Amino acid sequence: MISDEQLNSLAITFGIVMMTLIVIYHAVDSTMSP
Amino acid sequence: SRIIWATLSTFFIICMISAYMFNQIRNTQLAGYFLPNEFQHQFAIETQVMVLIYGTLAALVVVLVKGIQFLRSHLYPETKKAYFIDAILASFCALFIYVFFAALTTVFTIKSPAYPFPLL
Amino acid sequence: QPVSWPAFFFDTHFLIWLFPAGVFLLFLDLKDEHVFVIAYSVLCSYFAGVMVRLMLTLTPVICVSAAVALSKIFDIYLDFKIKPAALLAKLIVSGSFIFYLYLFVFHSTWVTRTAYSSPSVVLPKLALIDDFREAYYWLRMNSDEDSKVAAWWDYGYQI
Amino acid sequence: TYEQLYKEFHSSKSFQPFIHLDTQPKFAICGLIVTLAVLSSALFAVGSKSSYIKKLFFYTILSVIGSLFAGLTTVFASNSFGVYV
Amino acid sequence: DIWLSHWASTIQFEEYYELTNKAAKLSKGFSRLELMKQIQTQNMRQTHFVTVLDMLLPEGATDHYFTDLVGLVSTSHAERDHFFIRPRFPIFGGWNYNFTVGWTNKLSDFLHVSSGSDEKFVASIPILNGPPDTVYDNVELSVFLPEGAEIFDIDSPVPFTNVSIETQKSYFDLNKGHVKLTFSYRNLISQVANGQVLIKYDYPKSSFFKKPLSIACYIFTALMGVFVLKTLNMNV
Amino acid sequence: CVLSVFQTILKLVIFVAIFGAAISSRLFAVIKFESIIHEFDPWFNYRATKYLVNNSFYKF
Ligand SMILES: CCCCC/C=C/C/C=C/CCCCCCCC(=O)O[C@H](COC(=O)CCCCCCCCCCCCCCC)COP(=O)([O-])OCC[N+](C)(C)C
Ligand SMILES: CCCCC/C=C\C/C=C\CCCCCCCC(=O)O[C@H](COC(=O)CCCCCCCCCCCCCCC)COP(=O)([O-])OCC[N+](C)(C)C
Numbered sequence: 001m002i003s004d005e006q007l008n009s010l011a012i013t014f015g016i017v018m019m020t021l022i023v024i025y026h027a028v029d030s031t032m033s034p
Numbered sequence: 035s036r037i038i039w040a041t042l043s044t045f046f047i048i049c050m051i052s053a054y055m056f057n058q059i060r061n062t063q064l065a066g067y068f069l070p071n072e073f074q075h076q077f078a079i080e081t082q083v084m085v086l087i088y089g090t091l092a093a094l095v096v097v098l099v100k101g102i103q104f105l106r107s108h109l110y111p112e113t114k115k116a117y118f119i120d121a122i123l124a125s126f127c128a129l130f131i132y133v134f135f136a137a138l139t140t141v142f143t144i145k146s147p148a149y150p151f152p153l154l
Numbered sequence: 155q156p157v158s159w160p161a162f163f164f165d166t167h168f169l170i171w172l173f174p175a176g177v178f179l180l181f182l183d184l185k186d187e188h189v190f191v192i193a194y195s196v197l198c199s200y201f202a203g204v205m206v207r208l209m210l211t212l213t214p215v216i217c218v219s220a221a222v223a224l225s226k227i228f229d230i231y232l233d234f235k236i237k238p239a240a241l242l243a244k245l246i247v248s249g250s251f252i253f254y255l256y257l258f259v260f261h262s263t264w265v266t267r268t269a270y271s272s273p274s275v276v277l278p279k280l281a282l283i284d285d286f287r288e289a290y291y292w293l294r295m296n297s298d299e300d301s302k303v304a305a306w307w308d309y310g311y312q313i
Numbered sequence: 314t315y316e317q318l319y320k321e322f323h324s325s326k327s328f329q330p331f332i333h334l335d336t337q338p339k340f341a342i343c344g345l346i347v348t349l350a351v352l353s354s355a356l357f358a359v360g361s362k363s364s365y366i367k368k369l370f371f372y373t374i375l376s377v378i379g380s381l382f383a384g385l386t387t388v389f390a391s392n393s394f395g396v397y398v
Numbered sequence: 399d400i401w402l403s404h405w406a407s408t409i410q411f412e413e414y415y416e417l418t419n420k421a422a423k424l425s426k427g428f429s430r431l432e433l434m435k436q437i438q439t440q441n442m443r444q445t446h447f448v449t450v451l452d453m454l455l456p457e458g459a460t461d462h463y464f465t466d467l468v469g470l471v472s473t474s475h476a477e478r479d480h481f482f483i484r485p486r487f488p489i490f491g492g493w494n495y496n497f498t499v500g501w502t503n504k505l506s507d508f509l510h511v512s513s514g515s516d517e518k519f520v521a522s523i524p525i526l527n528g529p530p531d532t533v534y535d536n537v538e539l540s541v542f543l544p545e546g547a548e549i550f551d552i553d554s555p556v557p558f559t560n561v562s563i564e565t566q567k568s569y570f571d572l573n574k575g576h577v578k579l580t581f582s583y584r585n586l587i588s589q590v591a592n593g594q595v596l597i598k599y600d601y602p603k604s605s606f607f608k609k610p611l612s613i614a615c616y617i618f619t620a621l622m623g624v625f626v627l628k629t630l631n632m633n634v
Numbered sequence: 635c636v637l638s639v640f641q642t643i644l645k646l647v648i649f650v651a652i653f654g655a656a657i658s659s660r661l662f663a664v665i666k667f668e669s670i671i672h673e674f675d676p677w678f679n680y681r682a683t684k685y686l687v688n689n690s691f692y693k694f
């Protein structure tokens with residue numbers, strides 16, 4: 001199966017990707033919409 | 035007025051999240067300021083410091099969102115390069131938010147010395 | 155059973171200070187939904203201060219208000235529409251708060267892997283202790299099916 | 314008969330898998346992307362505001378491929394995750 | 399329970415053992431202190447209770463697992479076609495222990511392809527794989543073949559008490575479950591009951607490819623229903 | 635418009651990341667030890683739902 005340090009890396013990667021997509025979305029929406 | 039109610043409610047929230055009712059229910063001792071290596075017990079005075087910390091942090095963000103213009107209007111009313119005073123004050127607000135977050139993490143690491151992310 | 159102050163930081167990182175700030179900003183526009191938000195905030199702040207079990211019901215509002223606050227900030231410091239000074243001032247703040255976001259992600263992962271991910275039936279120099287399941291299974295396999303077991307009330311649900 | 318079968322069973326031909334299990338993960342991933350691409354287009358087709366006929370003739374032809382890929386992708390992902398089909 | 403899979407090309411074995419030691423009972427109850435004392439001094443001294451069992455699996459087994467009815471057991475060790483399993487408690491005289499063992503093998507060394515027709519398969523599956531000196535009062539050997547198979551011939555080396563053919567649905571079995579062929583046996587002995595059940599059957603390519611087709615038909619029906627309910631005016 | 639299709643794609647992707655995050659953040663005792671029920675009250679919840687599933691909704 002998958003070990004623990006791998007699931008930790010996976011959780012952290014999911015979180016980072018989520019928070020980066022959220023920041024990009026907010027920037028796009030705030031710059032291109034009054 | 036909206037401002038009076040806003041301030042009172044925010045101050046009550048800040049007092050409530052700083053473990054104020056812990057000194058009321060439990061009868062703790064003012065000081066010996068922070069009880070080291072204790073995650074569940076606390077001196078009473080720690081409710082008077084954290085408030086300040088919290089009371090400052092939130093405060094700064096409100097200034098960033100709302101009163102950036104008031105500071106230019108009243109500190110340097112020259113109005114020649116207002117867009118520059120705005121930028122400088124925003125940068126300083128960010129720097130001070132960072133300094134106070136660092137202070138918060140420092141006190142939290144005092145209360146729990148096994149903390150990997152101390153911000154400083 | 156009152157809760158001390160470090161737990162509020164333990165359970166929410168970087169989002170404890172933003173919560174009062176967001177209540178304030180939500181007390182500056184004062185629409186109809188914002189009254190509900192503020193009442194929720196104040197009531198659950200008190201209740202969680204008193205009882206340590208109600209923090210759960212206080213997290214959804216912490217989150218909401220925090221979000222609101224942060225969003226407001228971004229609405230000013232991520233809206234780029236040259237004057238490079240303003241660009242520097244926007245970059246500084248937006249980067250500081252994205253840094254805080256990443257730090258929050260790391261803190262959250264650490265806290266949940268260290269404090270809220272411990273089994274209950276097995277007890278972990280640093281060997282595994284499986285005495286509860288061993289004894290319960292013995293009881294299950296080598297006792298009569300209609301036997302009555304008398305023990306303290308803490309273990310009745312596992313027994 | 315048992316002996317006749319036991320002798321039939323010793324035919325030099327042995328089972329050879331269609332797609333080796335070691336390379337089934339990769340396929341899955343690949344399939345996944347396609348399953349996500351084409352399918353998504355079909356969903357966007359709805360709401361085009363064109364004629365009903367065009368939006369149907371397009372939705373069906375895009376789904377008769379999204380499905381065909383998604384079935385294989387599901388089989389491969391199940392096999393790769395340890396739950397064999 | 400032996401599950402054959404052509405897509406993954408694997409044969410999964412899973413056994414459930416209701417075991418009991420019928421030796422001399424323990425007089426004066428069970429004393430953990432006496433057990434620890436014996437362990438302390440009596441090194442490799444023959445006993446009449448069960449401490450460790452040694453399951454002998456087929457060559458090249460993988461993904462072993464040893465489970466109980468209250469979660470899994472962590473005292474298990476698999477080396478060189480061998481699997482040592484230690485129960486939760488030492489089975490003394492008159493005690494029971496119901497548990498499960500499982501593992502996986504390559505389907506290449508258990509399924510041969512008939513040279514008569516490329517779509518006709520034969521299988522030789524062992525009857526027993528367990529402890530070196532055990533006794534079985536009841537065996538139910540179930541073989542699960544894919545969703546499309548059609549049994550063609552069957553042979554058992556030792557007499558059976560009942561043989562049945564049915565279907566049992568499993569993961570992603572939509573039309574009709576796996577073909578399940580069950581043999582029943584009464585008095586089997588570990589080393590004496592050698593033999594390989596032989597099962598000839600058919601599996602045409604059209605049944606091979608019917609699984610992704612069924613899954614795709616389900617997904618396609620879901621999509622068509624979503625389209626229908628999304629292109630319908632229910633406004634007032 | 636163009637933006638109105640971007641903000642949609644992006645949003646979907648975001649909501650797939652959110653899920654992946656939460657789920658992956660909560661499977662830490664299942665992937666280290668085993669998939670089992672943890673505390674006292676969940677064991678009764680499990681007993682009751684198993685009873686429900688086995689017999690009937692009326693009998694439950
Ligand atoms: C929108 C959703 C899209 C998908 C997103 C989520 C999926 C990703 C999941 C990641 C890992 C999941 C697998 C866990 C690892 C093994 C679990 C296990 O081993 O447990 C299994 C349970 O298996 C499951 O049911 C898992 C299902 C497999 C998941 C594959 C993903 C595809 C899903 C797409 C669904 C499309 C539906 C179409 C409509 C027909 C218990 O096996 P057993 O005790 O019977 O032993 C088996 C041994 N015999 C057979 C000998 C007894
Ligand atoms: C709304 C959407 C939400 C999306 C997010 C939701 C859930 C994801 C979050 C967390 C997942 C936790 C991961 C647990 C994994 C434990 C099992 C394990 O460790 O598998 C790993 C293997 O992995 C893999 O290489 C799988 C690679 C395939 C990539 C995934 C395919 C896409 C599936 C999703 C879409 C499915 C349908 C598509 C069309 C409809 C170990 O396998 P093994 O050695 O144990 O057995 C296997 C025995 N062999 C090794 C012999 C086979």
Ligand SMILES: *[C@@H]1O[C@H](CO)[C@@H](O[C@@H]2O[C@H](CO)[C@@H](O[C@@H]3O[C@H](CO)[C@@H](O)[C@H](O)[C@@H]3O)[C@H](O)[C@H]2NC(C)=O)[C@H](O)[C@H]1NC(C)=O
Nearest residue numbers: 294295296297298299415416417418467493494495496497
């Ligand atoms: C674990 O496996 C053992 C071995 O089969 C199971 O023991 C069996 O348990 C059932 C019910 O617990 C016994 O049925 C009883 O039969 C007597 C007649 O002797 C009857 O008077 C009772 O009312 C009851 O129906 C069965 O005899 C017994 N088998 C043996 C050989 O002792 C045990 O139930 C299994 N435990 C679990 C948790 O699966």
Ligand SMILES: *[C@@H]1O[C@H](CO)[C@@H](O[C@@H]2O[C@H](CO)[C@@H](O)[C@H](O)[C@H]2NC(C)=O)[C@H](O)[C@H]1NC(C)=O
Nearest residue numbers: 538558559560561562563564579580581582583
């Ligand atoms: C051989 O087949 C099965 C073995 O389980 C038995 O026959 C069926 O038994 C089930 C009970 O598990 C009943 O529900 C069925 O009605 C029985 N008949 C059929 C046709 O399925 C029995 O042991 C044997 N049946 C024989 C000898 O006819």
